[PDB]
Amino acid sequence: IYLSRLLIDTGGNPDRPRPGRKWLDNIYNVHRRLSMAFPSGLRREQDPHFLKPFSPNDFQKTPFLFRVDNNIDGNDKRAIIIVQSVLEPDWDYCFQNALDFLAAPPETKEYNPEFKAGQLLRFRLRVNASVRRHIPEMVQQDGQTIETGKILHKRVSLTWDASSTPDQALADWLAAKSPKLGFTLQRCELLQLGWVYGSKPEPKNVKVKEQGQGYWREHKYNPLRFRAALLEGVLEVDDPKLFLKTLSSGIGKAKSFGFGLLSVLPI
Amino acid sequence: VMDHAACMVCKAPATTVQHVNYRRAGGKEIPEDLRALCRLCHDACTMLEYGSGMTTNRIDPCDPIWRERILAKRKEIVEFRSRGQRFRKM
Amino acid sequence: SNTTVEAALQVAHAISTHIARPEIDYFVAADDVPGEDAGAGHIGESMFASACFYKYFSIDWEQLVKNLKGDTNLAAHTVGAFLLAAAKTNPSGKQNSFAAHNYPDGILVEFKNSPISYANAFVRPVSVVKESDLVEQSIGQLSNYVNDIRLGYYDEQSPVIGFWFSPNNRYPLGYKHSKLASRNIGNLNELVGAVLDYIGGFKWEEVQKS
Amino acid sequence: SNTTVEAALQVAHAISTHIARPEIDYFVAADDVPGEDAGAGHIGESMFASACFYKYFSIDWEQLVKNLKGDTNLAAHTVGAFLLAAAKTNPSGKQNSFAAHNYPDGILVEFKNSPISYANAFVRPVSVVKESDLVEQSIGQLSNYVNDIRLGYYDEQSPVIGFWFSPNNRYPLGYKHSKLASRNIGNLNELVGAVLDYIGGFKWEEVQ
Amino acid sequence: NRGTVDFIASLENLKEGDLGILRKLRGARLDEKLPGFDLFSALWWPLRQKNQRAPKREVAWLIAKLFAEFRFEQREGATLPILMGGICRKLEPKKELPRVLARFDQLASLDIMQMEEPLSVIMGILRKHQQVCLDWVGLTDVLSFWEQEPVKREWSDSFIKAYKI
RNA sequence: GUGAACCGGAGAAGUCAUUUAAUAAGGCCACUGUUAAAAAGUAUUCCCCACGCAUGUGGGG
Ligand SMILES: [Zn+2]
């Protein structure tokens, strides 16, 4: 598989238009752009310069994993995007009209990861602290109303006991499912605990005009909220046929919006 | 909605629409006469057709002949614009 | 009416005393390996790579007293509680229970009538390879600059002195010949008692209520 | 009547000696009670910057006594207290959130018949090297320009006498082995007294 | 019209900094300097998107530059031909009057792009004779509908009516 | 299919020669942008689908 690197300028003059920095405001925009970085054959031949209208059905729907972190390069702040996929990405076709998005040209390296039993890898990982509660619908109404009755099962953020710590709680949450994916954690240090926001358009059929031919479509924007937890540590390995499938896929839900990427450095 | 919330040339979230053929306006236009664009690219297109003397056939951003001038104007806008002035005027 | 109340506390943006250390790259894992528990990797370094920080607070006693409409002992309790809180609180979560590393390595309580910042001690960056003596040379630079300022901008009308805290470790006896140090303290509660004694003569263990 | 009163003091816009790097402090307003039920972009933008400034004042000794109607002692007190305040006061703009009560690390006082501004020293931006800091390089370039002006536009009828202040001689007027000012001074009130007794025999005790 | 009145009110709402920004750009187009484009867009685009009969971009740009260099208070009944007729009937009819008449008559053979400089000359003549008022709205409408015949006929008729008082 | 029908005002021509709009002007005197903020120790994450339903796990926008 391949790992790709994108560098975005975070500092610079703050009184100028910075479309590369503004692109990281919406994570759906990031996912859509990385999807546009995967042309589907005849799209390149029909549109080499990427000027015809964008169509999701004209691009491949292969999954990929990416992580957006931040760093300092000498005396400048930078945002690094690490893209892990299974097919060779084409960053030339994606940003060819948006060369000002990236401060530095993209990079790509072939990854051939395999580790037999006895490797103490150093890992970094940003998970989505999500859980499906059995009773997540109390219907806490607002205003004058405070308590009405309905029940449904929904995904919400992970919660911890008031007498415990978030670090230990997330450590045992990761260790509880850990033998299924094939690793043992020695140290688990919590580095961040926050949210990830985004917006998504959805077509809506307002009334048909004179021969509207399938209603009049109007965009309506719906929000997207995720609870993110970034953590590093040291982990061993066992059953490498399971760890390779763990590396190929992600960990936790919402894998298509920056979560689940496991970064491992051999030691 | 015909263009999936993407600017045509730079592929960014579109916030405005630019006409191509003007001989349908006043409330009779067709969706094929209009092209979706963002703020930077539409400002570049407006700059590129200020005093060009185009009556009915205006700039088509999907045309691959207008790509270089639009990109150069976009670079000029990125280099020289001041967000403070626009934020102060509105 | 005038809803605005004037602040009685000024806090500076806490700046480090050295350059910002870059984090560990993770794109290099596809091309090479640091080795078998070797450097640029499994070094240990206790737990992680810390960062020295210089923090600055400036509480004005008169504005604090006039804000509370009298009640001088309550303002003293507020000052002591704020000092104790600022000594041993992490800005983010993961609250310490009892580790003794959350204690600051140096406090300089001073009683001027004009606010002076010693942030210009670290205009020259504090570069070092060993992180054990990084704090020590940071205290050395701060000591040199505070000696320079306190005997350069010195006026005879209000010659004031202050206190200092350390874990009797980073040369607290031997910098600037203890001209400003006066009382050298190794205990947090004793330092709070000394500050409360200098301000009005109270003690920390006495007043804890309204 | 003629309500216009001309001047006695000229102050130039203080400018940095290097390229400015403005920043944004992304602030947010955290609610106290859980139950906000608002997920969107509520981040804010507040701006700040840090720099090393060059200030330039100029007091006309005549035309200040003339405006004060011959009160030489009041004029001397005005000069001394202006020196004190300009040395130990900073603008009160967002000081409750940034708290930058920093003191100057060098003051150069000159007496001359025509005003000269050494702001052209920093036409070239002061890039920072690893061996030194910003203030030392700034003082070095200022000393370079001061010496070049001194040996340049130089007249025989008009002498120039200058002091040089630095706290405890931490930053001497660095220019090789050449000492420029006639009297290095390591204390503030001492230099105020020295300027005052150069002015014609005034002291910092009876004028107040 | 109403887009013209709102445009003129917005132009007179400006301060010295933006007037200087517009004044530095006389003799230039609109797609050249970013600050001028930003100021004119932020002054004109809401009015165009609200009113369908707002002035065109070229006419509005020309009036903006002329207001920048030749700031005159807006008054009704102070059109350009009327003031030119009032000025012209004070000089000798042998040398100076034919020259000023030729300067005024040059405008009929020019389109809207090449008309900033003769209008600047006419307004300089107006400013030299202690004038402090002008009808910006009527001039804007006349420039908007210019290639027609009745507008030029009314222009010359107003000039004759002011000249033969 | 009518005081009407049928019906060329046609050929031809350099407005050429001569001309500084020149001599002069300081746009000058006065002005804080001030008061405010955790991107993080939470108690519902904006939607769809596989399973048996002890504040349940997996998959996709
Ligand atoms: Zn665009």
UniProtKB/TrEMBL annotation, chain A:
<keyword id="KW-0378">Hydrolase</keyword>
<protein>
    <submittedName>
        <fullName>CRISPR-associated endoribonuclease Cse3</fullName>
        <ecNumber>3.1.-.-</ecNumber>
    </submittedName>
</protein>
UniProtKB/TrEMBL annotation, chain B:
<feature type="binding site">
    <location>
        <position position="10"/>
    </location>
    <ligand>
        <name>Mg(2+) 3</name>
    </ligand>
</feature>
<feature type="binding site">
    <location>
        <position position="38"/>
    </location>
    <ligand>
        <name>Mg(2+) 2</name>
    </ligand>
</feature>
<feature type="binding site">
    <location>
        <position position="41"/>
    </location>
    <ligand>
        <name>Mg(2+) 3</name>
    </ligand>
</feature>
<feature type="binding site">
    <location>
        <position position="38"/>
    </location>
    <ligand>
        <name>Mg(2+) 1</name>
    </ligand>
</feature>
<feature type="binding site">
    <location>
        <position position="10"/>
    </location>
    <ligand>
        <name>Mg(2+) 2</name>
    </ligand>
</feature>
<feature type="binding site">
    <location>
        <position position="10"/>
    </location>
    <ligand>
        <name>Mg(2+) 1</name>
    </ligand>
</feature>
<feature type="binding site">
    <location>
        <position position="10"/>
    </location>
    <ligand>
        <name>Zn(2+)</name>
    </ligand>
</feature>
<feature type="binding site">
    <location>
        <position position="41"/>
    </location>
    <ligand>
        <name>Zn(2+)</name>
    </ligand>
</feature>
<feature type="binding site">
    <location>
        <position position="41"/>
    </location>
    <ligand>
        <name>Mg(2+) 2</name>
    </ligand>
</feature>
<protein>
    <submittedName>
        <fullName>CRISPR system Cascade subunit CasD</fullName>
    </submittedName>
</protein>
<feature type="binding site">
    <location>
        <position position="38"/>
    </location>
    <ligand>
        <name>Zn(2+)</name>
    </ligand>
</feature>
Automatic annotation (TrEMBL), chain C:
<protein>
    <submittedName>
        <fullName>CRISPR system Cascade subunit CasC</fullName>
    </submittedName>
</protein>
From TrEMBL, chain E:
<protein>
    <submittedName>
        <fullName>CRISPR-associated protein Cse2 (CRISPR_cse2)</fullName>
    </submittedName>
</protein>
